Structure 1
Amino acid sequence: GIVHSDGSYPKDKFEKINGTWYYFDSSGYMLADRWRKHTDGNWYWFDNSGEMATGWKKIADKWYYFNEEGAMKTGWVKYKDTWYYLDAKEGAMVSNAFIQSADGTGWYYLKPDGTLADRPEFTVEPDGLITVK
C-alpha cells in the first residue's frame, strides 16, 4: 500500500508498487483473489498477494491466460509451442471439444487435457458413435 504526505491513499485505481501491479478498491484496499473487468473493458485477476495475474492461472479449478500487461485473452494461444483454446465468452481453456475452424471448412479438436490434437485418431461404431483418441 501507499500513503501520501496528506495521509490519503490510492482508491479505485491501478498502481505499480516496486515493479508489481495491484489494484486498490474505492476503499483503499487491494483486490486479492478477485476478478475485475476494468474500465478498459479487459478482465483482470489478482491473487492472494493482490498481484495482477500474468500468463496462465488456475482460478477456481479452471485455466485462464493473461497477456504481459494483465488482460485476459481468448481464442487460440500457444504455450510450449502447443495450442490451447480459451472460451471466447467466459475465457477458460476448453478441453475435449470440437472448435470449428475460422474458414468454416472444418474443426480443430482439443484433447481432455486442453492440448490441440493434430494427429486425432477416429473410431466410429455401428450406430455412428465417434470416439476420439
Structure 2
Amino acid sequence: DGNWYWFDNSGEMATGWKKIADKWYYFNEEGAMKTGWVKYKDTWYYLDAKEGAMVSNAFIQSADGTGWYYLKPDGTLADRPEFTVEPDGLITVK
C-alpha cells in the first residue's frame, strides 16, 4: 500500500491544507494525503474516505451509529453551543 501526494508545477510538495481544483485536501507533514477525521490546530475537519476531499455543510453519521456530526460551510465541526434547534425542529448553527 501507500498514499497519494501532490506536487505543484514548481516541484513543491503539498503538506497541510491545499486547495486543489475547487476542493480541499489535507496532507500530513510527510506529504501523505489524509482521509477521515483530522484535528488541525485544535479544530476538527472531515476528509472524504473515498477521494479525500474535505466535506462541508453536511451531516456525517457517527462511528457508533448513534447520531450525526455537522460540518459547517467552512468544513469545521460544530459544537453543541453552536446549535439552536427551534421548536418545530429546525436545526440552526452558528
**Shorter-chain TM-score above 0.5:** yes
Q: Residues 102 and 127 from structure 1, CA distance in 2 versus in 1: closer, same or farther, beyond 3 angstroms?
A: same
Unaligned segments of structure 2, at least 5 residues: none
Q: Residues 121 and 51 from structure 1, CA distance in 2 versus in 1: closer, same or farther, beyond 3 angstroms?
A: closer
Percent identity of paired positions between Structure 1 and Structure 2:
100
Please give the per-residue CA displacement for 1:90-109, whole angstroms capped at 9, x wherever unaligned.
Answer: 11111111111111111111
Report deviation, 1:44: 1.0
Runs of 4+ in structure 1 over 2 Å off: 119-133
Kindly indicate whether structure 1 or structure 2 has the higher relative contact order, using CA contacts under 8 Å at least 6 residues apart: 2
Structure 1 SS opposite 2:26: strand
**TM-score scaled to structure 1, two decimals?**
0.60
User: Superposition RMSD on alpha carbons, in Å?
Assistant: 2.2
In the alignment, the residues of structure 1 paired with residue 16 and residue 61 of structure 2 have an alpha-carbon distance, to the nearest angstrom, of 25
Which of these residues, 21, 28, 38, is aligned with residue 67 of structure 1? 28
Structure 2 SS opposite 1:120: helix
**TM-score scaled to structure 2, two decimals?**
0.82
In the alignment, the residues of structure 1 paired with residue 85 and residue 15 of structure 2 have an alpha-carbon distance, to the nearest angstrom, of 41
Report deviation, 1:113: 0.8
